[PDB]
């Protein structure tokens, strides 16, 4: 019953083509609910969930102002890190930022996150005690000193356990029929004959929510985890997810394989067979 609120910020510098492209995305659980694209004509924080469109124009005025401020901070950080790393001024570089919080079933604060990344690699992260930083290289040690002399982990503390935990319960309350639901998987098994002596059994799990699922293609108890495609949970597009797990069972040997599905929307794990 644990819930989380995440914010993803991606700033990609485009030298010779304008200002760094900035995209901000927010997610109550696995449900995007806000949005900001710097290339869009609106130039506002936009709602992407039906339960967030009820917030007053003061909420959207503030969200736009606070996301257009991170837009500028990332815009000067791209040129700052480009000098820390001594890189050319005509290359595209990315600054990804991901922060947020995790509350429990009772709405109490569990942990808070704040992680930056420069060019896909980790740059700096906020330690689990929420007062220390982990600088991932020799150019994030300079940032670490700034963020320690400026007490950045102390100003950010009041947001990660008091402003995320409070608005997150506001979101879980407004979107109660959307975010606090568990759709169990629609599981079925498909046999695809690939040869007269070789076959493949696919174990679908469609339309489930949340995305945390587990398909396990056991064989007489001993789980295999090998010779098994287990594609990443993919968005179905309507708030539900999809995922299948195949096995390459020889022909004439199918009715000894079981597929086991574990989902928090399931009363107990399944044992789909053919």
């Amino acid at each position: 019953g644990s819930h989380s609120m995440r914010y993803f910020f991606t700033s990609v510098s485009r030298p010779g083509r304008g200002e760094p492209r900035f995209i901000a995305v927010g997610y109550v659980d696995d449900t995007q609910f806000v949005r900001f694209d710097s290339d869009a004509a609106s130039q506002r924080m936009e709602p992407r969930a039906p339960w967030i469109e009820q917030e007053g124009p003061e909420y959207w005025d503030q969200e736009t102002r606070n996301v257009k401020a991170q837009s500028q901070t990332d815009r000067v950080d791209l040129g700052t890190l480009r000098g820390y790393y001594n890189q050319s001024e005509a290359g595209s570089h990315t600054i990804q930022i991901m922060y947020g919080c995790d509350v429990g079933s009772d709405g109490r604060f569990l942990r808070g996150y704040r992680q930056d990344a420069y060019d896909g690699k980790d740059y700096i992260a906020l330690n689990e005690d929420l007062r220390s930083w982990t600088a991932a290289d020799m150019a994030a040690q300079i940032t670490k000193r700034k963020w320690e002399a400026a007490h950045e982990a102390e100003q950010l503390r009041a947001y990660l356990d008091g402003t995320c935990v409070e608005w997150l319960r506001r979101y879980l309350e407004n979107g109660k029929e959307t975010l606090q639901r568990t759709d169990p998987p629609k599981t079925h098994m498909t046999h695809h004959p690939i040869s007269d002596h070789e076959a493949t059994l696919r174990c679908w799990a469609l339309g489930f929510y949340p995305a945390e699922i587990t398909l396990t293609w056991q064989r007489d108890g001993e789980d295999q985890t090998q010779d098994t495609e287990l594609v990443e949970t993919r968005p179905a597009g309507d708030g539900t997810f999809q995922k299948w797990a195949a096995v390459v069972v020889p022909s004439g040997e199918e009715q000894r394989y079981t597929c086991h599905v574990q989902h928090e929307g399931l009363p107990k794990p399944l044992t789909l067979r053919w």
Partner: antibody
Amino acid sequence: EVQLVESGGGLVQPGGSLRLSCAASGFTFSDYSIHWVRQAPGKGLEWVASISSSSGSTSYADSVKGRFTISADTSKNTAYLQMNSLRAEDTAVYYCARGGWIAAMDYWGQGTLVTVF
Amino acid sequence: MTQSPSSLSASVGDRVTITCRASQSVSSAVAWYQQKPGKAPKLLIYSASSLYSGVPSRFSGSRSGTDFTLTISSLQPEDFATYYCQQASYVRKTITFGQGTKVEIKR
């Protein structure tokens, strides 16, 4: 080191204006918030209004919403509280405090007695 | 909110507990102040459990459900004052102080 001094309130008739000022000294004014808290005579602490020096985010007690406004001259180390349309229920001792990143008012002033007559 | 008791009379040595029934506050925004007569308040416990710098270790703050409690482990003749719990709402942008609890002397 961190010292808050509030001054500027006293006798006032109802339906008039006062400007309480709180000259902060001992910290970077734009790093913390300044809260105005009043202690009605004999009664308990009442939070009145707030200012975030950076981003200029005000907030009021909803009993002083349209009648009190906080301004904060960052390049004076001072937070003001203009109190228009004063009632006889606005008489109290007004403290300015400092929100110190811990969601608590760690440093307080001494008090400005506003008596509406 | 409601702060209980409205006033308790305790003697030097007792363990006193003031409770504040915040039902919608984030523990983080629950602080405990102490005001002596005619003086500015004085922060004791921030984030509902964390002692403030310099406050003696006898003060502690807890949370049993939607109920935040201040405790003075062994009362001393400097703790007789009025204790206020606050609670800030980040959605509504309000700090609300509890009604106050006065600790006094016994016979």
